């Protein structure tokens, strides 16, 4: 909710986006930045020394202007705000830790996990890896209302802990599309290749709009009932990579401050569902988060000893856009082994 959390989380969002596109330049992208930020902030609760500093810096916090204690308090406040009751849109974010029964945890860690991140600690038998995998996937499935089913694909039988974050989002358009106006139409993959998609349309709409001539793109903001909205950015043909390289907190703020209401004759938007699964290890390493994965890992804030290390951070996200609204869900898991 506070300006320095939002500024770090947005910087992180666009840094992550840019690395995902570099890794897979021909693919759809869908992810939840705030899920990944919250999962890694949760991880940092247990980190010390260079392990900690790398995570907090990787999350784009300015440590000369903030502290780890202020950071965790900020995430506590965010989770409380996001999970408020609403009669307008459905939004939920949960955190959990799944821990080998016999692993000894600092009382301060378990208490802070519950107090700051809302996380329970589920005793989990990772040597029965299929059952542990199902329990974690079931927790995510429950939290995402069935939208994310296979967050955990493989679980090492020697896993000690898994930290999990999920986000569930379901919202109605303030101005919904009429399905009688949805028609099969071309979606151009390139100048000369297209696919046929259901193209929804709205007519005689007045919405915030900005033509960014310098970046060769058009920006519109569509609204959901409730506190959420969505920026749609439409680069001109073959200008996507130019717009992507300009993505930043500064550009998003400029776009938001440049929108003007404009009567739109017709707006055409595909009806679509897309999903992506990620192994974030190489991305996080590019962002400087390195020691947590190594034999020099310092997670002694979890146990009291330097005996734990991150093996893998995974993320899965799904996005459904249709005439009545949008449904989107994602989840992030941090798998941790003995060291």
């Amino acid at each position: 909710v506070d300006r320095g959390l939002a500024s770090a989380n947005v910087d992180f969002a666009f840094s992550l986006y840019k690395q995902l596109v570099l890794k897979a330049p021909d693919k759809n992208v869908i992810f939840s930045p705030v899920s990944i930020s919250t999962a890694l902030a949760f991880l940092s609760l247990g980190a010390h020394n260079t392990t900690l500093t790398e995570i907090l810096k990787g999350l784009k916090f300015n440590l000369t202007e903030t502290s780890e204690a202020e950071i965790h308090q900020s995430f506590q406040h965010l989770l409380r705000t996001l999970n408020q009751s609403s009669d307008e849109l459905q939004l939920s974010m949960g955190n959990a830790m799944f821990v080998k029964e016999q692993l000894s945890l600092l009382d301060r860690f378990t208490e802070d996990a519950k107090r700051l991140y809302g996380s329970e600690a589920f005793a989990t038998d990772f040597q029965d890896s299929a059952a542990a995998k199902k329990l974690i996937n079931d927790y995510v499935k429950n939290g995402t209302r069935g939208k994310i089913t296979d967050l955990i694909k493989d679980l090492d039988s020697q896993t000690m802990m898994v930290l999990v974050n999920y986000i569930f989002f379901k919202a109605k358009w303030e101005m919904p599309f009429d399905p009688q106006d949805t028609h099969q139409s071309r979606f151009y993959l390139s100048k000369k290749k297209w696919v046929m998609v259901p193209m929804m349309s709205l007519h005689h709409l007045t919405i915030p709009y900005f033509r960014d001539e310098e970046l060769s793109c058009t920006v519109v903001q569509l609204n959901y009932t409730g506190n959420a909205s969505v920026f749609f950015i439409l680069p001109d043909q073959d200008k996507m990579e130019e717009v992507e390289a300009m993505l930043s907190r500064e550009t998003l703020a400029r776009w938001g401050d440049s929108l003007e209401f404009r009567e739109i004759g017709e707006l055409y938007l595909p009806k679509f569902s897309i999903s992506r699964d990620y192994n974030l290890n190489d991305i996080l390493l590019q962002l400087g988060i390195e020691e947590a994965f190594t034999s020099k890992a310092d997670l002694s804030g979890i146990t009291g000893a330097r005996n734990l290390a991150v093996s893998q951070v995974v993320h899965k996200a799904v996005l459904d856009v249709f005439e009545e609204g949008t449904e989107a869900s994602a989840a992030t898991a941090v798998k941790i082994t003995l060291l």
């Binding site: 909710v1 300006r3 959390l5 939002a6 989380n9 947005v10 969002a13 986006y17 596109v21 021909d26 693919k27 759809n28 992208v29 869908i30 992810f31 939840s32 930045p33 705030v34 965010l78 705000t81 996001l82 986000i167 989002f169 139409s185 071309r186 979606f187 151009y188 993959l189 297209w194 998609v197 519109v220 506190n227 959420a228 909205s229 969505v230 920026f231 749609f232 950015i233 439409l234 680069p235 043909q237 996507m240 717009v243 992507e244 404009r262 009567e263 739109i264 004759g265 017709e266 707006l267 055409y268 595909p270 679509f272 897309i274 996200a317 996005l319 856009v321 949008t326 989107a328 994602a330």
Partner: protein, 34 residues
């Protein structure tokens, strides 16, 4: 009459007005991609 036609790759950024959180960020290069 202005026309806004999302019939080529586009970005979607789902934002919260309260917290300024980015809930979801997306690039649709192919709505039918495997």
């Amino acid at each position: 009459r202005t026309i806004v036609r999302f019939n080529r790759p586009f970005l979607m950024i789902i934002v919260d007005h309260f917290t300024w959180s980015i809930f979801f960020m997306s690039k649709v290069t192919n709505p039918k991609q495997a």
